[PDB]
Amino acid sequence: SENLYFQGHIETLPDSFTFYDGTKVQRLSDWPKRAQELKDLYQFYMYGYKPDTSVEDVTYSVNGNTLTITVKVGDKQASFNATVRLPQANSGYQPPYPVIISLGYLAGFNWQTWQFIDYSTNAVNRGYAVISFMPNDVARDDSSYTGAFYTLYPHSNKVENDTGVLMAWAWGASKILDALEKGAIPEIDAKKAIVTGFSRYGKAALVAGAFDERFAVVNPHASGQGGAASFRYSFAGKQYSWGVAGNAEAFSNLQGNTEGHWFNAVFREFKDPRQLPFDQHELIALCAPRTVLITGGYSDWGTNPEGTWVSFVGARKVYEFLGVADRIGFALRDGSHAITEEDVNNLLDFCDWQLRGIQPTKDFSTSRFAIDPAWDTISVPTL
Template identity: 40%
Template sequence: MAFFAILPLLYLLTIVQAGLAAHPQTCPPTLSRSLPAPTDLPIIEALPDPWTFFNNASLKSPADWACRKAELLTLVQEYMYGYYPDTSRETVKASRDGDTLVVTVSVGKKSGKFNVTLSMPTNVNATRRDPVPVVISAGGVNDTVFLGSGVALATFTVTDVAADSTTPGGVFWDLYSGEDIGVITAWAWGFNRILDAIIEVVPEFDQKRVGVIGCSRDGKAALAAGIFDERITLTMPMSSGLEGIAPWRFQFQELGENEKITNITGYAPYWTNTNLLKFVNNSHQIPFDSHLNVALVAPRAIIWDEGTIDYWTNPEGEARVTFLASKAVYDWLGASDKIGVAIRDSGHCDIFGYTNIQAFMLKEFFGTPTDRNYSDISPYTPYPTAYPWIDSAPGKSLG
């Protein structure tokens, strides 16, 4: 796919970042599709430095973040996600029948559709004049946490969008057959097209208070959805593991094995583009890590949940490494209260996880005060070996 496929995203990124800084430095040359092969990239032992451009030039202040964010968006697409489709070529139409939303997407003469289930809050009357926040959910959640808090749900099945299989199937592949795009990106595209449909025919949902959520592989997709769509105000990846919140470079396996790139490329290589498979022998050559995927959401809000005995998803790495490294970027941007981690003493996709993030969600959607410290990584401790650059952020915070 041509590099121009990401231009609409970069344009949107520029508009959003205008509120952060009026006069960034001149950006380094835009990265092209002639980037190095994975095997030709340098080995980076620690987490890649957020404040160093791909050409090794240094950022000078938070005003430069828009430039860095734009090149990171290219890097994660080139080496992991595949290039997000050019949505300017798409036509999205929505129809609504009771609690069913039908999303139809067309590209040229190709077309496909999938269904979404709408659930209204139980304690408020959602109207065009008084719209409610909405969370787009990949699969079921603890409904009470959302509907009982005045938050609507729009729930879909990711496999209707793209099959969880090496054999392409679903609406996305009806439109983009043959493209080197990961299924995680296809699922993220599904979240984003649902938001298009909501904007078109569900005026009771507040377009300025939109969340995305998913657990496990759906959590990987929720993170990608937050990365690729600046309209999403709260991203909530649950128990997402590798290709989500877990770091590529640092595993903590004293109590149980962590998911690794060799595992994923063995049982689900189609989750990403083919370039990622070429890092299987050295993940230290990946020019980003999970902290930079999280930082691509900045300065919008993100909260993730993890269970201390969910060893496969590397909860220790998500807290000790990813959280503290990505929070440094949020702090630098003056958005310290927009990132959080919620740790619980249980396993994979525990239903308590939704209660675990509830206070953060209510703070973001309604301004509800909370005493919960969502920067607390206990029972874990910081792992400074992973981020030797953490105290070298250039310039001042914008906060």
């Protein structure tokens, strides 16, 4: 069954270039209106709503390596800590520096010793500041709906209050950027901010990049289903040259008691992902015209490697339409579900290119996957 002439399969991928009312996106000036529709769809049907930022008062305090972020909403206020690491002069770069805001530590896990491997060193040595926070401080990874976000915005089932945990974590990243824009760390350039996260935090990194236009680089790492991976296209059992694909995460697993708190109540009622009014090529395209880098592993089957490619190819159509196709990149590598040194180095190479003009040695526009006419069904509008 390796003859691909007889392996094709067609899903309907909701068209990025069709407005909610059925008319077509034709001009560059049409895109902002279409993007707002997609943001409204994703908030109502999947993640819940980002709160109005205009009525949040953000203050900060710096003590050694700790940046304390404090936010006040009405008569309530809540704080959480972020850890700051800056480059030295010997990096060959002077302040202010671009900054990687990491949801979780920028660090890998050694399965032999169960010790962590700090990759924030790689970043500061290449002239990137690193600010990390612990996402559970902002919202716990469960259905208690507690943490700094929910102190300020108590959860309920009313549409305006039914905000899921991934949107809460993304809000955490945005609050650090708020403090940086207010000059909390003068050595950091808030206009060169990069958001990154692994696995569950990679889903939230993508949400942060789609809903907060100030991030210059968005890096969902191994984000999988509910992140960059297509809901409608998965390839369990397909024979690749590096192996037979395992199962991608099941839609119902996203909705159940171990993960459903990531999303809202509407999302948890769907019977089938084909009922969603979008697929994830649209969430990625919400980052345009800012830059996005999809990283992960070719053998990380639960995150749906080729379905992530499907979403990337479809999202890139919007980037092409806007005239900035170079700003979306793809970089899977060998192996499985992990933060590896190569993942971090690929991010830093992508940032040096997009932010500093340094030409990369990697081709960020291709992969091991072919482009399959069966799923390559989003097309750029004619001029």
